[PDB]
Design an enzyme around this catalytic site. Structure first.
Site, PDB file in Angstrom:
ATOM      1  CB  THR G   9      -1.130   0.018   1.275  1.00 35.68           C
ATOM      2  OG1 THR G   9      -1.869   1.051   1.084  1.00 35.68           O
ATOM      3  CG2 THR G   9      -0.196   0.228   2.547  1.00 35.68           C
ATOM      4  CB  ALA G  57      -4.732  -6.268   7.274  1.00 37.21           C
TER       5      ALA G  57
END
Lengths: 118, 197, 262, 212, 208, 197, 208, 203, 197, 208
Positions: G9, G57
């Protein structure tokens, strides 16, 4: 294992991996007709006598040297019924047919190499 | 590793470089021109594995002069690219695990300039501005931000200078000075080197 | 043309990719990238020898992994007027390795003026498959009537051969061949043999994952060659309830070119 | 030895305005054979919360049998019933408790919020919840989702208005999508179980699907 | 590393039938030829297992001990087959999670409260019920016939069920590497548990 | 896959088992693991299932050619030498244990063995196969000398039936065949005809 | 099992005379299939700090939750707000406790306190470097250059917002994992305030 | 290995109309170097091919196929029937079966004599197969069968065909990292070729 | 390392071979591969050479303690259960194939087997060892029922002597020992006393 | 992979004696029990070999062919044992250098021109002569007795040499895994080559 005892004409081929065979179906596909002929010659020489392989191979040599010059496609109409592959169509003529060669050499160079002068 | 960029324009194929050598932990030489010349209108940038780059470039360069000297006229950039790609693919797949990157250039007389990007598996694109090496990651966004579709030759040098300043400030390695060459419809022009004190 | 060629080119299977392929595969194996796959169509094939002729049959699903690539793919080929074969696994290889023998037998038949014999096809297939030791996998079920009598063969992907009165080869085959083991009796009739092979192939298609859709039969009796396709539809797709068609102007557009041909 | 094996399945969940729907195919398949054809994959937890658990069928049972016990413990302790907003965090904590020996499951939670509202959560094998509106997933995923993306929330469509989802449309869409996606996948088919849930309870639904 | 063959079973109108082969294979050799593989844990539940044999002995001892303790206590309550199935599932899963698996695969059948139960307890923590079942290598050969007959007719009687099991033994003996001529069987009808054996399978090799 | 041969006065017997398989699953229930090369010499097979077939075909070719060339019936020693020379030369990927036997007009009755590795030697009784290691003691303790056709057939039936039950690879019908001075006769033992033990 | 989430990301944060600005994308990939489009990554732990997300995550979410609990406990105990440096060192110790077992996280805890601003950085490796300009994740590059070229430490508010939007858009146009939405966060004396959310398509249309 | 680059191609057979569409992107794994890279080749006039996969072999196979097609067209006189190119590419791919290429071509066109629409497909090493309704192949193969199966319909006019081929790609290809940022639509009706360029999410 | 036991009416016999080795070299020419646990139960050994000794010592300890605690002669089933429980619990690094047999006042005459893996079962004749796979056919075909001590001893001698010659691990003297209702008697067969075949 | 045991030999006053075991081992099983391992290549040289057996057959054929051709030619000349030893050494070395070794180990003995010759031709290209020799596993057990007796007395007669070989067979049969009761022997005195066998070895196990 040879030393040097023109690189543009023949170049870009490292010595590393020609003495390292590729996918094991390499020596059984690059040299197939020669191996089959050798096996048949050995069998005939063992079981029938020394005359047959000599006669047949020298017949091969006699018929081989009447084709067109190397820089053109060879019909090879003869030598085929004598070889025994008169109707044995296989993975030798339908895949990468030499008539439509993707790359082609110079005429004089190829004929002088075929003569073995180089 | 190294650094190669090239920006297109209306009538120029301006390319930069990185005059530097390599070794284990040492810099052998601080000025090593990587820009091989093809003809009066074609350049050929090449960064890759040591030795194989200078061999492949030499082989592909003493083959385009043959065409000119045997047919009077000169090749076109598109033919040069579609020939270099074919040679690279055939030779790499043949027997050699090469690793070479190339960045063609050139200015023909019918359709503007032409800049070609080629990876090490012998692909061929026509990007308006490409990059190589590791500095590509940190500099391609900078090149894309200010790139107006039309750029004057005066502003191209300034854009290149900013793009190299950012790399010299935010990079691990010590690229000390860069070379600049611009091609127009007059031959192969040259500009003063870019050196950071 | 070219300036770096000495010897004339030689045909056959080329090999100027494995050197790059190996290093590329090594690069992409540890990085968790996509991997190539082929249509490993594991399919059931059944054959029985009844009183007069032979009956063949196979399913018509062609997968390429976990996704159903095709819903209708013929698993029965043509070799001669009275010889049929079947394929199993790596359909790409089996198609060519059956077509080659079909052409060779056609040449032999044209040169002889009489119908070919199954043993010739068996010999040629065995020779070729053993020549290519491994590295090419096409399990076949060779059956056909000749001047002598009914015959059947069970060629393996290494060169083995057999002469069973019934055979079942492919990924999902145990169910069908167990049905054969339970119901088969010697010297049956035509319709009974067709019903038996249909039942066996239905059991195989239901109790497996590599097979599905329609089935077919290839009755090759002495003086009548039949090729029924499809024979029976076991599963039929339902119907879509709500219309989801999009009308004109639904999608946008950026540029458009129109060029008229002749 | 390998303490993991696949068993297929498929989970789809539509969170409308005042209704949650969870549906799943029913087929336990491992290797290349079929074990059974009933094998329901939609278990009830409370009067207003349904859990769908795909993935390996050796932990899909353990998590189901642990969640109900922990729910009973919470009800006995705090003298209430867990809402659908807390089960997500509780299951995430349980899932992350074994980050070094991960559970091989793909869980989907659907239910009603404090007020009448649709809500469907979505997890990952390591365990990390995230609120969604039409999230699906499971073994035969990546095929169910794009059609729902096209239909439920109008994307890449222009000059089209927005209409809330009606209950009559939801089942008609779900049945159609499962029928369309059953053919091209290997692990799906057999029987389909629907667990549409509203503010009056839980009602079931079973239809045929590419009979095998 | 003694190994079994197949412990298949089918449901039934008021009862369950389970069959197994009295064989023990030392990899490829047939070391033992009289060992049994069927249990009588209580008056309404029976058992069968495949795979390794020492683990089968161990669970035999443990489960017999548990059931005898429960009966000895005395409350008018017994172990319904569902509870035994759940206990086996939990034990297998707990052993799996500890990196010490029991290489075993069992079938639990019984008839309590006027209904039949049959389950699968595969070592990886797999559990379910079905009208028919097979174990080990029989999951490909034994299952299809039973599934076909059950789909054609969902309810049966004793004669056709017994003949179906006989036919399945015939085919499995025909086409399996590890098998024996003799095999055991035991029904679990409401009278009790009746272990029967040994049996025999007449064959025909007329197509030789 | 148990194969064995026994020699008596005036001829030899030859048995086999038909349970060719592919692992834990039975491939073919009944087969003919007994190839009739020429008209007297018989050749059994073991090991793999394709190399043996290729070797048998080559042997048939060469031996038929030799016999028709000399216009005389073949001698079993010629077949043994041919098998040895074919097997030993390719001792890298030709895992095929073979046993051959037959009768000839001169010194009739011969049993030859040629295990994996190309070695060739003659013995009174030859045994070979994966499931052919459980009857060594029985055959050593029972095989006397001076037996005719009937008791030799019974002994072969018993000895093969013993291993027919104590193995996983073996199982099924039995394929006794006896080659004598006059001709070749074959029979199959099935069902209860097989002795129990 | 399969790849968990979020192979990569992008995010960035620079500080100037009016606090600290945080920007982030939203695309939690799973190797080669897009799992979601609107997953929030700027994690809120209290109305004074702004946790960030990168790498994995579940690990990031769990460790921010533990950090929030510890910060709340300290707040309740000592009656005084905790400085950013203390929280950064706490998270550094907790993450460095486990190393080599596969942990992967990049967080950029930032906020206002008695010493002014602060934008300390910590990750799975264990270093606790400070700074005035940061960007982590796969798409950190392709944005680093632009956001370093534009930064001047004397910018206004709207100019800084435009700079952040341009940097994120140019990063996500060239990368292959970033994209979706753009979240912009501001920090001041009275805690953070959410600035705006935007879609990549509209920014591309208005920047064309 | 079909992830070092990107690509996705469909083909739908309507009512005397065939449509082929692709995706324009060329990038080295995560990075991206260009937005325009053709993957549709105009072989013949009312015929097209749809190579999609690793680009460095796409270029080579396209060049060799074009060479052989020109040779056959010049030698044999008249145009090539659509079924012939199927066996053409099958032979060309099986030429290097052991050293396999990386291409999953799609062929879609019309018969120059009958004007009967034809669509086929190929695997990695050459295995001919023909599907009547549609076919699709590419890197993102999994996330298109679901989008196409429901939305399809037999006997479609060109406008509905264009709408369906647009809707089965535009919102079905963005659900993946690689192989995005642009869509080319080629519609081949009976008399005139027409090309369109859609717009999609720039991410 | 061939070990076998046979049961007859009123007692059992027990034989062994003394050729413990360490590979291609003979370690000890003559040994006692027959341990007298308590006074009636006898325990042979196979597999390794240290785990078996440790297991035998532990069994002796526990069984002697149990027998002196109950003030009664032990039962062979107790020894079998103890061996099973000791072996199975440690089924990771305790490769020790064991065979035990003995006599007890109640249902005298017992032969138990407990191969590697901890499984326990009873059989009329038990055979175990690396060189104990070549006599299965002979023992199956010869062992009838209803034999007394003398012919049982002769049968054991013949059956063990058969494998005594067709193996590399076996070779040397033979250690027949018969446990009966009254007591234990031992004898050794050496030289020509060993039957030929 | 048939294997031999030992082909030891000792020199002698006008002659050489070689002994070998008529055994063939298939790894551990004793597959063959009558094969021979001694050759009679000509009228003044003999041969013995160990290791693999097929290669021994092949060299037997080749060397017999060579010697019969030389004798058939006719010149009043033969092959002295030194020449045969050199030829074997060259063949073994050439085969070794080609990555196709012959797993064999041979002994060449003879008596020409009123002197004795004995050599070692190990597959790795090792060659020498010695008053005594042993092969295979006998290099540790068979050698020491012969070496001790030869060092005590460098010249012997026929009786003590034969008894020494007998004693060596006795000990080797006592303490080797691969051995047989019977064994062959052959002297090469100037009368000719006299192959003798089979023999026997009476043993004593009185310390049992």
């Amino acid at each position: 294992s040879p030393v040097t005892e023109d690189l543009l004409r023949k170049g870009f081929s490292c010595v590393k991996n020609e003495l390292l065979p590729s996918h094991p179906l390499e020596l059984s596909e690059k040299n197939f007709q020669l191996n089959q002929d050798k096996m048949n010659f050995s069998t005939l020489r063992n079981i029938q006598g020394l005359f047959a392989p000599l006669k047949l191979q020298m017949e091969f040599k006699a018929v081989q040297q009447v084709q067109r010059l190397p820089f053109l496609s060879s019909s090879n109409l003869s030598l085929d019924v004598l070889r025994g592959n008169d109707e044995t169509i296989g993975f030798e003529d339908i895949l990468n047919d030499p008539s439509q060669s993707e790359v082609m050499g110079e005429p004089h160079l190829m004929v002088e190499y075929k003569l073995g002068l180089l | 590793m190294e650094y190669l960029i090239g920006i297109q324009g209306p009538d120029y194929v301006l390319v930069a470089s990185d005059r530097v050598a390599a070794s284990n932990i040492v810099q052998m030489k601080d000025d090593h021109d990587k820009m091989f010349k093809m003809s009066e209108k074609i350049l050929l940038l090449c960064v890759g594995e040591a030795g194989d780059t200078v061999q492949f470039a030499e082989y592909i360069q003493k083959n385009v002069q043959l065409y000119k000297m045997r047919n009077g006229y000169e090749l076109s950039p598109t033919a040069a690219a579609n020939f270099t790609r074919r040679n690279l693919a055939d030779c790499l797949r043949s027997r050699t695990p090469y690793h070479v990157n190339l960045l063609l250039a050139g200015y023909d007389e019918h359709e503007g300039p032409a800049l070609y990007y080629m990876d090490y598996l012998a692909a061929l694109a026509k990007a308006p501005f490409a990059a190589h090496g590791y500095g590509a990651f940190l500099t391609l966004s900078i090149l894309d931000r200010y790139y107006t579709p039309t750029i004057s030759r005066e502003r191209a040098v300034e854009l290149l200078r900013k793009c190299l300043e950012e790399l010299q400030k935010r990079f691990i390695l010590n690229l000390p000075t860069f070379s600049v060459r611009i091609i127009d419809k007059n031959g192969i022009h040259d500009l003063d080197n870019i050196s950071f004190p | 043309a070219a300036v770096s060629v000495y010897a004339p080119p030689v045909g056959g299977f080329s090999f100027d990719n494995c050197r790059r392929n190996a290093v590329l595969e090594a690069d992409f194996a540890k990085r968790g990238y996509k991997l190539p796959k082929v249509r490993k169509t594991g399919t059931t094939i059944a054959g029985v020898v009844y009183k007069d002729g032979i009956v063949l049959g196979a399913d018509t699903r062609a997968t390429e992994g976990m996704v159903v690539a095709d819903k209708n793919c013929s698993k029965i080929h043509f070799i001669s007027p009275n010889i049929y074969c079947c394929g199993a696994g790596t359909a790409a290889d089996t198609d060519m390795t059956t077509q080659l023998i079909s052409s060779n037998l056609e040449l032999h038949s044209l040169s002889t003026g009489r119908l070919p014999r199954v043993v010739t096809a068996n010999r040629m297939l065995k020779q070729m498959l053993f020549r290519y030791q491994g590295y090419i996998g096409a399990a076949l079920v060779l059956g056909g009537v000749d001047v002598t009598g009914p015959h059947l063969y069970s060629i393996y992907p290494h060169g083995s051969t057999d002469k069973l009165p019934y055979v079942t080869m492919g990924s999902g085959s145990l169910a069908a061949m167990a049905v054969f083991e339970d119901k088969f009796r010697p010297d049956m009739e035509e319709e009974e043999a067709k019903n038996l092979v249909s039942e066996a192939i239905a059991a195989g298609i239901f109790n497996d994952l590599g097979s599905g859709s329609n089935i077919d039969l290839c009755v090759i009796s002495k003086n009548k060659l039949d090729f029924l396709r499809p024979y029976t539809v076991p599963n039929k797709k339902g119907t879509r309830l709500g219309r989801y068609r999009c009308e004109k102007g639904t999608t946008a557009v950026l540029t458009e070119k129109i060029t008229p041909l002749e | 030895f390998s303490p993991y094996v696949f068993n297929g399945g498929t989970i789809l969940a539509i969170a409308g305005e005042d209704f949650a729907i969870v549906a799943s195919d029913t087929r336990l398949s491992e290797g290349f054979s079929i074990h059974t054809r009933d094998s329901p994959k939609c278990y009830k937890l409370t009067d207003k919360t349904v859990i769908g658990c795909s993935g390996f069928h050796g932990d899909c049972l353990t998590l189901t049998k642990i969640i109900e016990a922990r729910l009973k413990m919470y009800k006995h302790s705090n003298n209430k019933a867990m809402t659908t907003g807390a089960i997500a965090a509780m299951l995430s904590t349980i899932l992350y408790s074994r980050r070094f020996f991960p559970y091989y499951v793909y869980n989907i939670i659907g239910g009603l919020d404090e007020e009448g509202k649709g809500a469907v959560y979505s997890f990952d094998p390591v365990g990390s919840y995230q609120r969604d509106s039409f999230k699906a997933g499971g073994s035969a995923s990546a095929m169910l989702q794009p059609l729902l993306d096209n239909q439920v929330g109008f994307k890449n469509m222009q000059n089209v208005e927005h209409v809330p989802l009606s209950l009559d449309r939801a089942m008609r869409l779900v049945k159609d999508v499962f029928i369309s996606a059953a053919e091209r996948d290997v692990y799906t088919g057999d029987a389909l179980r629907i667990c549409i849930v509203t503010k009056e309870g839980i009602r079931e639904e079973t239809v045929s699907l590419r009979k095998d | 590393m003694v190994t079994g063959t197949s412990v298949l079973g089918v449901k039934f109108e008021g009862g369950v039938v389970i069959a197994a082969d009295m064989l023990g294979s030392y990899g490829s050799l047939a070391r033992f030829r009289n060992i049994s593989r069927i249990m009588r844990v209580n008056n309404s539940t029976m058992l069968g297992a495949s795979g390794d044999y020492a683990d089968f002995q161990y669970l035999k001892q443990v489960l017999g001990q548990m059931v005898i303790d429960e009966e000895l206590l005395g409350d008018g309550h017994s172990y319904s087959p569902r509870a035994i199935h759940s206990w086996l599932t939990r034990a297998m899963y707990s052993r799996r999670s500890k990196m010490n698996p029991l290489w075993n695969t069992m079938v639990i059948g019984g008839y309590a409260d006027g209904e039949s139960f049959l389950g699968y307890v595969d070592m990886l923590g797999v559990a379910y019920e079905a009208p028919s079942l097979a174990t080990g290598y029989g999951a490909y050969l034994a299952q299809p016939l039973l599934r076909e007959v059950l789909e054609k007719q969902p309810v049966l009687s004793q004669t056709e069920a017994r003949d179906l099991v006989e036919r399945c033994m015939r085919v499995l003996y025909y086409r399996d590497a590890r098998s024996y001529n003799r095999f055991q069987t035991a029904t679990v009808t409401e009278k009790g548990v009746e272990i029967e054996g040994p049996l025999s399978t007449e064959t025909n090799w007329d197509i030789a | 896959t148990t194969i064995m041969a026994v020699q008596f006065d005036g001829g030899v017997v030859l048995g086999a088992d038909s349970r060719t398989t592919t692992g834990s699953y039975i491939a073919n229930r009944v087969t003919d693991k007994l190839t009739p090369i020429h008209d007297r010499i018989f050749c059994c097979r073991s090991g793999s299932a394709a190399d043996t077939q290729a070797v048998a075909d080559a042997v048939t070719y060469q031996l038929g050619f030799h016999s028709i060339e000399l216009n005389e019936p073949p001698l079993v020693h010629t077949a043994a030498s041919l098998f040895k020379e074919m097997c030993y030369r390719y001792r890298e990927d030709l895992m095929a244990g073979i046993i051959i036997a037959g009768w000839d007009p001169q010194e009739g009755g011969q049993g030859y063995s040629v295990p994996m590795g190309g070695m060739m030697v003659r013995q009174s009784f030859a045994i070979g196969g994966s499931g052919s290691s459980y009857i060594y003691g029985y055959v050593d303790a029972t095989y006397r000398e001076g037996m005719t056709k009937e008791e030799c057939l019974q002994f072969t039936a018993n000895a093969l039936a013993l291993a027919m039950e104590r193995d996983g690879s073996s199982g099924g019908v039995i394929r006794l065949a006896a080659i004598a001075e006059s001709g070749v006769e074959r029979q199959v033992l099935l069902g209860d005809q097989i002795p129990k033990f | 099992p399969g790849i968990e989430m979020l192979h990569g990301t992008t995010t960035l944060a620079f500080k100037f005379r009016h606090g600290v600005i945080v920007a982030a994308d939203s695309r939690a990939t799973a190797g080669a299939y897009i799992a979601s489009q609107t997953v929030k990554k700027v994690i809120e732990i209290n109305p004074y700090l702004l946790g960030t997300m990168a790498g994995g995550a579940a690990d990031c979410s769990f460790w921010e939750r533990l950090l929030a609990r510890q910060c709340r406990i300290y707040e309740l105990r000592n009656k005084e707000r905790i400085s950013v440096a203390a929280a950064s060192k706490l998270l550094a110790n907790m993450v460095y406790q486990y190393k080599g077992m596969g942990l992967s996280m990049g967080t950029m805890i930032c906020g206002w306190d008695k010493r002014g601003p602060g934008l300390y950085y910590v990750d799975s490796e264990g270093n606790r470097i400070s700074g005035a300009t940061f960007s982590v994740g796969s798409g950190s590059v392709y944005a680093y250059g632009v956001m370093d070229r534009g930064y001047s430490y004397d910018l206004e508010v709207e100019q800084a917002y435009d700079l952040a939007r341009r940097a994120i858009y140019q990063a996500t146009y060239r990368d292959a994992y970033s994209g979706g939405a753009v979240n912009l966060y501001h920090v001041r004396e009275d805690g953070w305030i959410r600035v705006s959310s935007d879609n990549v398509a509209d920014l591309h249309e208005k920047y064309s | 290995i079909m992830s070092y680059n990107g690509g996705a191609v469909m083909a739908m057979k309507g009512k005397n109309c065939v449509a082929i569409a692709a995706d324009r992107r060329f990038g080295i794994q995560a990075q991206m170097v260009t937005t325009d890279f053709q993957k549709i080749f105009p072989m013949g006039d009312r015929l097209y091919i749809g190579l999609a996969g690793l680009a460095t072999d796409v270029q080579t196979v396209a060049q060799r196929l074009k060479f052989r097609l020109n040779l056959y067209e010049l030698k044999e006189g008249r145009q090539i029937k659509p079924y012939t190119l199927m066996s053409m590419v099958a032979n060309l791919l099986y030429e290097k079966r052991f050293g396999p290429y990386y291409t999953e071509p799609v062929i879609a066109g019309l018969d120059p004599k009958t004007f009967k629409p034809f669509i086929c497909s190929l695997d990695l090493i050459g295995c001919p197969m023909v599907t009547d309704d549609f076919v699709v192949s590419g890197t993102c193969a999994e996330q298109m069968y679901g989008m196409c199966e429901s939305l399809w319909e037999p006997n479609m006019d060109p406008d509905h065909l264009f709408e369906t081929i647009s809707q089965a790609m535009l919102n079905a290809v963005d659900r993946d990292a690689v192989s995005g940022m642009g869509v080319i639509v080629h519609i081949i009706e009976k008399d005139k070729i027409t090309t369109r360029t859609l717009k999609a999410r720039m991410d």
